[PDB]
């Protein structure tokens, strides 16, 4: 029998409604294109930028209503989100591939499968290299039997980082860090006992997520410099902050 720590139950209760988010972003992009005439239609890159934008909107709404995070004053909330916004987007994408992804394609938040082949044919070297290490990370997580309880734990570990300067209530953040780490450790030890170091193996994925996240930020920033990013984009505001 599986055992799930009470804390992780609380974390799961704060999870977004995936079908609702999917339908919402799907409808948003379809309406966006509908409002544009033929020569105004967004390119693939433009669409994906607005898609990532809407995902980030959803992530901010998730955090705002979530346990522990809603306890902080807005100034601490901003600082935490300013630190980890791209990490959460990458983590969200990666886990989506672990669960909903077929190894030959990319599963988008809007629900479509985009073949990796299309990316290899239409994207430059930077994006392909970026996708390649995402693929490796997804493959690694699959081999570890990465599941939803561990995902929601890592999500909170990413959000409540202690590497954030100028934090007002840093010991609350430290408290969440310790509680979630402890719960994750107990969960892995109880439910995956033949993987004696699964906890450590999961933690080691965090610097890999952060490295991908930094490269992704840099890729997007330079795409913006060439004028390829569609106008106004919470992504871009997060970058310019």
């Amino acid at each position: 029998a599986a055992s799930i720590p009470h804390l992780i139950l609380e974390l799961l209760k704060c999870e977004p409604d995936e079908p609702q988010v999917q339908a919402k972003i799907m409808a948003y992009l379809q309406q966006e294109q509908a409002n544009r005439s033929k020569h105004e239609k967004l390119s693939t890159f433009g669409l994906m930028c607005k898609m990532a934008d809407q995902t980030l909107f959803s992530i901010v709404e998730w955090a705002r209503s979530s346990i522990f995070f809603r306890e902080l004053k807005v100034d601490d909330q901003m600082k935490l989100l300013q630190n980890c916004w791209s990490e959460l987007l990458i983590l969200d994408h990666i886990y989506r591939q672990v669960v909903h992804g077929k190894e030959g394609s990319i599963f988008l938040v809007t629900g479509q499968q985009v073949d990796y082949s299309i990316i290899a044919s239409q994207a430059g070297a930077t994006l392909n290299n970026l996708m390649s290490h995402a693929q490796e990370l997804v493959a690694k997580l699959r081999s570890l039997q990465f599941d939803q309880r561990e995902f929601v734990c890592l999500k909170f570990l990413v959000l409540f980082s202690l590497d954030v300067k100028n934090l007002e209530n840093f010991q609350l953040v430290e408290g969440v860090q310790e509680q979630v780490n402890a719960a994750l450790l107990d969960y892995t030890m109880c439910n995956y006992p033949q993987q004696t170091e699964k906890f450590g193996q999961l933690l080691l994925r965090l610097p890999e997520i952060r490295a991908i996240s930094m490269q992704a930020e840099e890729y997007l920033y330079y795409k913006h410099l060439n004028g390829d990013v569609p106008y106004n984009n919470l992504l871009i505001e997060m970058l310019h902050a």
């Binding site: 705002r64 901003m78 300013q82 919470l234 505001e237 997060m238 902050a241």
Partner: peptide
């Protein structure tokens, strides 16, 4: 980041 601040409210 006035936009992020707004969204959190």
């Amino acid at each position: 980041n006035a936009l992020l601040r707004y969204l959190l409210d």
